[model samples]
Target chain A: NGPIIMTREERMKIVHEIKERILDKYGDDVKAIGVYGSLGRQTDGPYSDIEMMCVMSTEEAEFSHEWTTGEWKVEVNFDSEEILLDYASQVESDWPLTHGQFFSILPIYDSGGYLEKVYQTAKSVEAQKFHDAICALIVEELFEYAGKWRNIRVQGPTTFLPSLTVQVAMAGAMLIGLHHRICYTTSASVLTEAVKQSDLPSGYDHLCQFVMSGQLSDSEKLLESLENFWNGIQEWTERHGYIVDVSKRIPF
Target chain B: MNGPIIMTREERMKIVHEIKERILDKYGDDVKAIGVYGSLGRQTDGPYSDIEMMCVMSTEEAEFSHEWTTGEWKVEVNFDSEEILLDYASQVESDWPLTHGQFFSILPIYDSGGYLEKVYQTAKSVEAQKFHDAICALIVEELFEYAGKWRNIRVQGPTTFLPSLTVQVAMAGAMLIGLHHRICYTTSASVLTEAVKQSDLPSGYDHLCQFVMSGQLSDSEKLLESLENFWNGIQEWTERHGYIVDVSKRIPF
Candidate 1:
């Protein structure tokens, strides 16, 4: 995921006929099958993964597979009908990031008209509360990664190696902070879009530039900006009053 | 988690009754049910055994948590709605990973709707099996990300972030290969020791084990060396099992 991209074209070059083989292979055991993830949502890029899920009837049929199709990689989540539907409800209610991903699925085969209902339930998860929970969790995870960077064993000088991946999650939080309810996207486009509308603390903009910045630069300046940016987030959550133990978060 | 775990069954039963009284006194009929899990419920608890519990109520969707040191032991209490309990049962019944940490092997303190029995029925030992592969997948990602992060941070002198995590991942992969559930033990070394005994993992487990137990995460050259050995172990294990790992995104050694 660091330097290589897994685009839809790269994935589809060979995986297109997998459904036929899958149906032929499983036969009566599989109740339904479909593709999910970036390819399903038509948001294909080099960084995206090929994800598929299917429901089966018997206990022996449950599986999660990682297969290589041509030059691309594929991931599958296979389970029983009862289990699949149960997770759908959990996704619709509490789990958010995965809820965003499951919300977008391209159906290949369905006999009982189930995938539509699953998609509909996912659509109903309230956006306001969801974003609030997401922003809170992002900040919570931020510090843990930040602390890891502060490990003195590797940290050489004045600056620390903060998580650039975590920086993106923070960017996602800022976007949710400004836009009360943005359509849950399957890609990182939301962060870019949010950067246009939301105002980040001074010096923190370089964080968004981490991807393109060919070399690692001054951690001294970056750490100062990170502190300011993190402080701004705490104040924003406090004002929103979405800080709740309901989802196991601490806004204080 | 601090002191030695040593609660007798009778002693834990006494604590459960006390906890029940406290809940009924506070919420009355609003309290629908209560239950226990973990070491206390399993009857494997010792003198310092911590108590893990949950209470289901008919009140509006509200919840609270409590954790207190009981001199000889510690106790944790989680409060939730009957609605949430049902949803959790659904989650476990569906075999979702990391969601059923508390549901398996629950010992009931009280039951109102037979919900505890329904919840217990969903607790199949095989549910934990999903964690083995899930953890391996996590390790694969951890392997790549940790390597990349270390490569970027390479300019910053000696580091253990990569090596410490490598051992952690290697240990997790070993546990998965050996078919061990995390609930069976608390310490990573105990898990690794058990894995080395049970699985076809290579002999250098003590090497990784000693590194983790030694409390050293410095010395980049040594870390990379250990990382290489752990990777080779993974390679051997996967090859023996006829598994083709997707190493496309992982940093090359």
Candidate 2:
């Protein structure tokens, strides 16, 4: 069989053993150590890998240490405080899914209040930045999806519909999280948590449900869902005073 | 200064008639299609809008375009072999926005085998990704160079070439927008203004475009600010769209 899946208690003991080894090796140079992702959020199942970061005191020491211990995998990303803070504040396309780690990391060891500053930096990102990121997702992913939908509808090769529908759902979840200034706790919970949002584009919930139903075979039904979702995005953007339709025909 | 730049539809048709007659008298059955495009094709010509037409000849003939300024108005026409015309129609280039529309909306004076209709369909069916790729190419080829030229001017001093360079950059930006929207301005005369009217642009694209279009690049500080804003906008925009404009390696291989 594959490496045995350890219990949550066994996982924590391994985490502790790893922490002790890190503490013995780095000592005072380790400014702060924290767990993120599924482990940090305390939703780890039997097989979830350990995802953590170590903020080093010096800028020169930056790297990622990843290894597999027969039963589990561990990845510790080491970064200087400056680099860590920079990552905490970046507003990119995946911000909705990944940035929450900065705010929710459970600190294992803290020195000089580094984790607090990380949270502050993440929260300090401006609303306009979020707006631009959201607009980019809508135009780049959603708008492109609409074109692909029409292309597939007119052409044959309907086999791509299911994969395309899942992709749309993922992008929709990302859009909703960006719009609401929240993040799904884990990748597995994206659609579930996305549909729970009170403020969202019309037909978004139905689209999400369509994704969940796994019944995306009928071409006409798929078209209806996607078209309604596209229409909903237009009206929703208008309602919320967001711009997603036009850009400098040239980016620069 | 002559009668007037504006020509009524029939007046324009008469000019087309003369050109068609001469073209047919010369080429006869070799001419596969003769069509008017641009303002004449769309019937949206203003007093100053010039004439543009296409004459598709048989594959045996060559390809060439001619423009003449008659003091009263300007006119341009392209005479191309069937192979050449179709190849041109199939392209998705930076200027495709302003140029490709002619293939799609030709006002046919004559068509031996519905050649212009095939041209329209060919132009229309170009993949959307091709347009995006064309825009990305423009950003790297044109905008990146402009940034360097702008920096040199900022450090040394403004050269005589600055004005022309600004116009070149603006025009390049206009073409980028055209391909983005698959649209054409009425004419190149107001391309900058028309581009600014577009929505969801990079944050300061309008400012940079308007500043360049105003013919006011005299103030280095103001120009610098506009360029900085536009460049910053581009950086953020590229990150969002995953357009790779910079890389550490000379060649990945």
Candidate 3:
């Protein structure tokens, strides 16, 4: 009758099982292994793929491999020793993929102080710049689309004018804020293991609400709200001097 | 040096002097006016505002007595019965926006009949399910970036990616045919028109090339070349179909 559902804990357990299999097969040479994508963030549906990045020592170059264990069909890619060392030396370089990793990571195995290194590097200024760049691109895109769509809406009575463009744009803006909150909380987690978790901004929550509403006519209002959200975040970015300007950068 | 890069004669005479200025100053009662982004169908530069789409209609129950015009700085709004009727019955519903109207229309105002309508509607039917679900999903998610880059590229890049994306995706399966003839046309207009002219197939050129290149790397040369031939005549659909497939549908179509 209703859609099938599973709890976060249930999915995390499966992810852990998959990670454990990697450790069993690869042993200690596996420097670090963490879950990513949907399941990494604990937002997986029933059929989400088990995505993981297996980090190994430079000498262990041959360890790059792929296989399936049980019900989980694993896709594994190797990051060379140089890449890992570069990540550790300057965490910002790793930001592109790591922000996705840090916010949604499920660390299964690490040795030679690797897990701590990942957590520490992930919390650096470099990572924040990477995060800011991505969010800026999201905001810039939303603002542009809103302007065009608004023009389209005012110009014609054509039934197909508004459509689903507005809803999807709103969803993209919310995802940026979602990742930012996750990064903030995790860094706080490292500080004392106990800090009253900070919540995502009200603006992000509102954008998510608009997307979920599924009403195409609400596009104008949604666009206006996204513009306001973008302005606020943009101000925050300016004050903080993060790596990029949210309004100026073009993602494409 | 270049006297303000002369605006297209068609745009200047038809859209600017007659449609744009007239609509802004004289046609307010019968039509609603608004400016659209992008350069008609070619591309827009940073300095080029290209004041497009002067909508002019009234919400009043009774017909108005006289024509009217409103001028606000460089922007002008006009309200007139004749312009409103022309826009409503012809220009507004046509698919001019999708077919790169600026390039195709020799007489922009008169040629503004059903081109976008035909292009968008045909694209819609040809890629109906995919258009609504996936393409739109991608477009909206990255609309601002896409529009900006599209604007910038049309002005600066080797060529505009918007038209390129359309031509590539529309002629994905037909590259093999073009390649077989050893003709190297990379621009979107050349590729799409070629496909429409039955010289190519339908498929995203980059995506197909990516797949083929990957296949080649993996020693799947036969599959790579076969896919090149496979996508040539997939069909023509709505110009908006790409938006629907990438933005609205949320999945590949």
Candidate 4:
């Protein structure tokens, strides 16, 4: 059984309680505390959950504590300052979704300016690095999806195409984020918000909108949409000088 | 500016011994199974091969890896839980024929409850249908991707990417052979040669394997010719074996 959803006031009170509990347990070891996700972005709906981070100065311990009561779901990553900085600076496939917390945390506690350093580290990543991430998305996600689409077409299993199309849309959104060097505030509207952003490939928004429209009954239309988006991406890479046709042999 | 590698088998064992001692001293009884995989496990390691090991821990331990480079060679020791190792063994994917070898071929230094043997058994007991799926995946995922990359290289310039792409295609071909025959090579260094020796290979498979293995991929014209020949051979082979890689309709309907 699930409990009723809480108002913003109630969510703030719960966050306050969590902040106090973390402080009481860790004491001076707690370096910084902040809330992220929908709560941090000031877009919390009744169904929104809590995502928080607690950067510690104690040893090198890094992990997360996640739990759900009848009323609310909460996840607080307890990480060392060093590890938090490392994570904030890293480029990953889901960087747009995951790295937003470091850049825009609603701070509950700060003593040593660790939060500012986290923001700076995340902000100062190289554009070439983002381009590298985009290339990885093309090969690993987009190209792989194309292959899977062809396989499904041959094997007569068209059921998984809808979910795979959704993934392709998310991959498109991530490519946009990496291109513009930005992050979405909430994942609930990542598709819509990403499509509205500028500096996208020509038909990327069309693909994203089709995926969000949820009218994926026809298999031919879905394949066409994926192929169109992939073609647009090839042109986008060429126009922006991203160099997807990598010449260098060994990465090292 | 570089030092010589510890080429002797006895000398290589000392580094592994040091790693075992370090891991045992650090985690002690929390380690459920510790072993070496990859080339070292098969005793086919060359002077340049990296040392790959697995350190299986209890369910409470989070999965991480200790990867570092010494002056001579690199080392990668993955620390995972028993459940995690089981999940790895259960996976059936495009590269399963190449990747699943580690699960079955580990030479353990510490065998707790014969867990390493259990892992080997888990990898060994995968159904034939799953292997069939893996073969189809290799076709579309690796081989098709390489075909696209080759086109990119053709339209675009810098044909040096062709050599590496040929290796990928060759690897996919080897994976196809391995999945078909249900065999695993002792080491990746021997994948092409060993796959060539296997029975019931595709028509042009040996030529492509030797083309890559013998370093003849530098000639762009010959490389493209070899690739086209292998593609035709694989298409025929899949059709003959009822692999169903190409179709006219979206689905059977």
Candidate 5:
């Protein structure tokens, strides 16, 4: 265990040296150093792998540099500005994954503020566009996970609870999107950011918990709660008198 | 929406039978309420449809799944607790969509406690003002209108003909939802588009047809700007008549 495992401390120290070296090497052209995923969420453990995105004006490829443990401490994804825009506009294959990665990022090195500008522009839209795109994602996830194979379902609560929990989070994401808020999917700032614009429905936190708790709330009670919720949200959103653009859907 | 569209009803029925058979085979007494919704329940599915299932098994409480799709049909199996289902008796209305659909369109494949039968007698209801308000709300959100318009005309290229067709369908669908009108799955894309283009919800047609194309947007910006105009005109037209939109509920029911 001692030789095989590398702790976050040792890994980060190595990552620190590499980042310092890269800045020295690439100098003015290293547009940004972005970090996302569990590390961005600040919930990483000893076993966590480094998840980072590196952008440059030059055509440099991914670094083969390895951690002392022979795995990478800085799993760098090299990109160009052209690549970033492509992902932002892509609502099909790479859209979901790209949106997830892009949204959760923190810019460590913004040589010319490129990363910030990219995300800023990406987020500049009416509340409903975000809602439409975001809901399509939530609905897509729900439809996919709910219809998984039998062996997975047989695993019962363990296998399916995560998917339902995600649905709750996606519901929250929809609220974030609906308010035209700039929310990182992995940030604590979402709570306050969302409050600044709109509040989720009542008991939303509890409802999320109930979803993950599996058999906690009786189905009848859950049914009543969800029905009231469905009605309330429908009413609240409808009263806004917003135009619905239904042209965009999940990739069918 | 994620899977196949050409599998026959017979092929789907066989798949459903295997899923159902596997369930009983595995759990037996643990299984309780079982039903099917969407095309499978109503048997209205044609070549291009997925099976919809609603299954509830005996557990202490409940777990719900959003609708799912496999190779042939999309199945949604919500957890069943008879202790929970019978609780529906003498309830105010069939509020939960699962139960509501059960009382109306949901076909029961298995019912043990006679629970679903008991609840079937109750009447369905809706919040009328809220319904209208929400319908009005639909015409405002920029995300739905602007972003979608851009994405279709420019970003991902024009989506399938069905996407553009469904846009109109949704506008009409929004009206039905606001009025508490229920709907089955799909009919024809062009049909529903025509339904709203003519109906009470403030009209737009050729714009929708342009968006739903395998071809291309001849003019993405003009199209988007025109869409914005259509969106704006429709909402104001809707409100002046009577109903107000997006006003929050005060009493909090």
Candidate 6:
């Protein structure tokens, strides 16, 4: 039978203990070992996997081959000295996945290099640019679809309104992408300034101010404004350029 | 002395005709020229720039060039054979500045290729992706900031509830990003199914639906919900991982 379901706290405790065991068994030889996936992040339900990465020198025995336990299934990948160094570089660059994983995952015992790598990576230009690009693409697709839905409504008169919801989300993503682009394109001098002067409405200004301030209570309202702004943007885009079609190949 | 500023349709038409004459006179033998941008789209504004393009033979022009005349400006270039035949492909793959310029400026007349080229180019993959990413980022940053303000209000006083207006507008951008990410990763089929099923609540389904139904009126609530869902997804991811960080790092889908 599967292990009994555990509370969040209980599961975290188990995860911590697993990390300690890995460290105790491999200490000094281990470059780094941390949890990933659901369990490591504390959002695991009962059956979530215990995603772990035990970093070791290429010469050392593979962690995956060496470790086995009934309580948890472990995943191990060997990092060459060069790979380890590259990983370190990425961390320093603040790769979003790395930063997000590090910040979200709990560490039972970090061998000193963990948090530093994350901090450094958070400040990396490459990482920031990658993130900005990812976000921008996400927003563009949503808005395109929303515009399509609106056209459908005009032509087909369907009752489906959720299509607009997707449009709104795309708009929010655009704002995030824009903020990052502005931050990097201008060499980070005016991160928040662009938001202040954005073409978004006053209500949007209010929302931007709110998120920058770090308050998350009215999550629903924030979501709504993002949708509206996206629509307005689509409206603007359509008036200026016709709807962006994803059907055929587009030239830049 | 500064040049006169003409903002009327009649003025714009006169300028367009003059621009055509210049193009015809300069490169009439070796190339075909067309006017593009806002004027071509029929949505010109008072202070808009006249964006004109000349399609010269490959042997005649090496690259695109821009010039300012007495009243209008011309961007002269030779289109790659592929570009000349499929202009939309060029627009879709252009960078941020070029895309913005293309949309904002006026193109009074274009040659044989019908307006379909314009519409098709705007809808292409490369152009769509670049445009989507640039614009979506702007929306997210603004909405997140907006969400923060409302939180303060609710905490400070009950009467400060502007929920009626704020939530609706904010979700607009949030849902847009979510849908974009989903579509980028999966096909249209998956996205449509997800929206229909509402399988993901805090991930932005509710607000997405609202916007789809209400259009402009649904902006506030949908915007708020979308932002909330994104934040929730991030938080959920964070909580699962055991630490808090910005959402930029996570895979949005």
TM-scores vs. true structure, each candidate: 0.47, 0.50, 0.38, 0.54, 0.40, 0.34
In lDDT terms, how accurate is model 5?
Answer: 0.46
Best model number under TM-score: 4
B1-253 per-residue lDDT for model 2 (tens digits): 1212445677777877788887788778888899998767988654434567898888554887654434344456788988887787878877777677677568998999998888888888888888877877666555654565555555553343343444456667678777777776664444666777886577677876654544344455766677767767876765676655334332111
Candidate 3 lDDT at A43 equals 52
Chain A TM-score, structure 2: 0.92
Q: Please write out the lDDT profile of model 1 over residues A1-252, one tens digit for every residue.
A: 232444466567435566666677778877777777667878555444567788787775567766432234456677887776666544221252355555678888888766776676655655565655544443334433333333212333221232232333344444453334334453234334445555444334555443223122445554554555555555555565544243321111
Error of 2 at B237 (Å): 41
Error of 2 at B241 (Å): 37
Better of 3 and 6 by DockQ: 6
TM-score (chain B only), all candidates = 0.65, 0.87, 0.26, 0.86, 0.59, 0.39
True contacts kept of 2: 0.00
Please give, for residues A1-252, the per-residue lDDT of candidate 5 as tens digits.
Answer: 101234556655655665677688768778888767655555444444556777778753444322222222334566777776555544431232236566667667787888776676565544455555544443343233333322123332222232233344345544544445444443222332333445555544544444323232243344344434434443444555432333322111
Q: Considering TM-score, where higher is better, how would the candidates rank from best to worst?
A: 4, 2, 1, 5, 3, 6
TM-score of candidate 3 against the unseen true structure: 0.38
- What are the iRMS values of all candidates? 13.5, 25.3, 21.7, 22.0, 24.9, 16.3
- Residue ranges of candidate 1 with Cα displaced over 4 Å: A1-16, A25-31, A42-49, A55-63, A68-72, A79-96, A131-161, A164-194, A197-207, A210-219, A238-252, B1-253
lDDT (10s digit) by residue, model 3, range A1-252: 001234557656755765676677667767887776666666554433445666777573643433222223334555655565455444232233235454466666666656556555555545455465444443333333333434434542222222223333333433343344333222111211111224333455454333333233444565566555545554554454443422211111
Against the native complex, each candidate's DockQ, computed on alpha carbons, is 0.03, 0.01, 0.01, 0.02, 0.02, 0.05
Q: Which regions of candidate 3 are displaced past 4 Å?
A: A1-29, A34-46, A59-73, A81-100, A103-109, A127-140, A154-181, A184-206, A223-252, B1-41, B44-253
RMSD of every candidate to native, in Å, equals 11.2, 23.6, 20.4, 18.0, 23.0, 15.3
Q: On residues A30-148, what C-alpha lDDT tens digit does candidate 6 reach at each position?
A: 66666655555555544333455555644734434222122223343445444444554442222322334434434444566754464354345364445444433333344333333
Q: After superposing candidate 6, which stretches have Cα over 4 Å from the reference?
A: A1-9, A20-29, A35-53, A59-98, A110-115, A126-143, A155-167, A170-174, A177-228, A231-252, B1-253
> In Å, what is the interface RMSD of model 2?
25.3
Better candidate number, 4 or 5, judged by lDDT: 4
Query: Residue B117's C-alpha lDDT in candidate 4?
Result: 89
- Please tell me which model should have the higher TM-score, number 2 or number 5: 2
- Tell me the docking grade of candidate 6: incorrect
